[PDB]
Structure 1
């Protein structure tokens, strides 16, 4: 259809514990800046800065393993 798109205008400042995270997605390229959104065990959603080591590590891990 024509749903709204998820964008991030601010990033969490805290590294999340690995086992708090159960999934991720990357925000559209239409958004004004790049971002990763992590889904948690309690199903919360968290904007996270893709420039940071820990974010990439979790992304690599959720994708590959």
Structure 2
């Protein structure tokens, strides 16, 4: 969102947003360090939203973004 004092998301809704309108995602887990594991979907507008990392619908769209972002192997961010 605007001024994020934390690295993780808030909470995900039933079925947040279409996974095809997401530009890039950030995969937030408790492994990283947070109480709420969620993948944030950075939409076309540049807004990130919390989506369920367990649900199958998410794991497909993640792959799509992984393979498209993989085109850029140099990652500074």
The two structures have a TM-score, normalised by structure 1, of 0.75
Q: Which runs of 4+ in 1 moved over 3 A?
A: none
**Which has a greater percent of strand?**
1
How big is the alpha-carbon RMSD for the aligned residues of Structure 1 and Structure 2? 2.1
- Number of residue pairs matched? 63
**Which has a greater percent of helix?**
1
Structure 1 gaps, min length 5 = none
Structure 2 gaps, min length 5 = 69-77
The two structures have a TM-score, normalised by structure 2, of 0.66
